[PDB]
């Protein structure tokens, strides 16, 4: 038996199928990530993503920042994390404005591995991306606040 | 046993969704309503851009203009007497 096979059976598509790319564990894992919830509202996805990211973002700012050895470490670090959340929300926003026209339909795939048709991800639309960004901002700030609370209150 | 179809150019060029799942929302319904009502104002990209830029600038200006001396050495200023220059210059 062999381990590496052409991507979805097609040997002339520029990829390969390996345990890293396609195995039950990783497939299940990725398919259950908020980014790949292709049938749910992009808003909620945004909330999850932003929540997790702001939450992790609080960490390195607090301990590595310039005020790490001061009584005002948590405030400073968390504020900085919120700042990066805002900036990244700005980035996401301009990405959405530049990539999708309000009229243009979804650029997401409309097929599955099996080859059957399905509803394209509304994440790849103007409105959908705008919702996702709103979720990243709300969830981002919320996550920063929550992490700060757990760490210093 | 072929991979070329004019009627199906999608499968021909591997335009597949490798990890996208058609599953319904697994999220908390109450929290879903909470976020769908409270995070709504930020779902308009133009308004969100204006809010993030103006609000961000305003916040930055606030924390900057009111920064304590115990945080920024630049606001605390010099605390030691000045040293004279190389050629007796102030």
């Amino acid at each position: 038996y062999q381990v590496i096979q052409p991507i979805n059976g097609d040997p002339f598509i520029g990829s390969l199928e390996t345990p890293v790319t396609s195995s039950p564990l990783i497939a299940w894992y990725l398919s259950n990530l908020p980014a790949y919830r292709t049938a749910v509202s992009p808003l909620l996805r945004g909330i999850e993503v932003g929540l997790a990211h702001g939450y992790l973002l609080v960490g390195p700012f607090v301990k590595a920042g310039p005020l790490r050895n001061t009584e005002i470490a948590g405030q400073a670090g968390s504020l900085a994390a919120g700042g990066l959340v805002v900036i990244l929300s700005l980035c996401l926003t301009i990405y959405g404005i530049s990539s999708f026209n309000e009229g243009a339909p979804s650029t997401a795939p409309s097929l599955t591995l099996t080859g059957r048709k399905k509803e394209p991800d509304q994440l790849q639309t103007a409105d959908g991306w705008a919702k996702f960004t709103g979720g990243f901002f709300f969830g981002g700030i919320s996550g920063v606040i929550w992490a700060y609370f757990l760490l210093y209150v | 046993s072929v991979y070329f179809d004019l009627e199906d150019l999608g499968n021909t060029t591997g335009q597949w969704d490798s990890y996208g799942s058609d599953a319904p929302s697994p999220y908390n319904p109450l929290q879903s309503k909470l976020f769908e009502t409270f995070a709504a104002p930020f779902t308009k990209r133009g308004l969100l851009l204006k809010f993030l830029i103006l609000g961000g600038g305003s916040t930055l200006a606030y924390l900057s203009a009111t920064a304590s001396g115990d945080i920024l050495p630049i606001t605390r200023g010099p605390q030691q007497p000045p040293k004279l220059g190389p050629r007796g210059k102030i």
Partner: peptide
């Protein structure tokens, strides 16, 4: 020292952000 605390972050952070975003959108259109 009063004004610099206002104008420096304004020109060093806000201005280039606004300008870069604007130019990005302009060039991408």
């Amino acid at each position: 020292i009063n004004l610099p605390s206002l104008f420096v972050p304004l020109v060093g952070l806000l201005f280039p952000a606004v300008a870069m975003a604007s130019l990005f959108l302009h060039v991408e259109k």
